[PDB]
Amino acid sequence: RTTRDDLINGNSASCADVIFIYARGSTETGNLGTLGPSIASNLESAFGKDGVWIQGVGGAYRATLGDNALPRGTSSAAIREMLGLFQQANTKCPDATYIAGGYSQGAALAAASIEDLDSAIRDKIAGTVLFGYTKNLQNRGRIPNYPADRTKVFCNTGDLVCTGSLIVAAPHLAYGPDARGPAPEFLIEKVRAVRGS
Question: Which Cys pairs are S-S linked?
């Protein structure tokens, strides 16, 4: 449901082929929040339960609303937590293909983490999806040091956070349809592009 720690719980002897690391939005529950579960279910349908590990960013990432105002759109502690998860993935399952995603503050967190990640690990992330990307205008719709072709941003018309503000309006809470269809569609496509099938 809202909490998945497949990577942390997973046995290195039987690594999944795909590992998905996702950061929730501000004030959301568990480590997956409102959008994570929908994406997870669809990934599982495509690769099978044993074929994909779903891992939300918990630990030090409290998803505190106020942290949206910090320089990188989230806290240093949160970035350290997500970086640690990518490092864990690389250590536990070096041959798996990684994919990532984030919503709202989680999107800024995903972007910041990926930007700071060691290139060798970053290059293993086949695709990343960002919903209500708080640094969309500032970063020109990109994740620093990460290819545009592997990035997909979902920014609704009227969602003020995509336009340089921190105001939360109704369109910011309307990403349900995207998480149910195009987002997992994109991730699946990007994984198959490099892994074949």
Answer: 15-93, 155-162
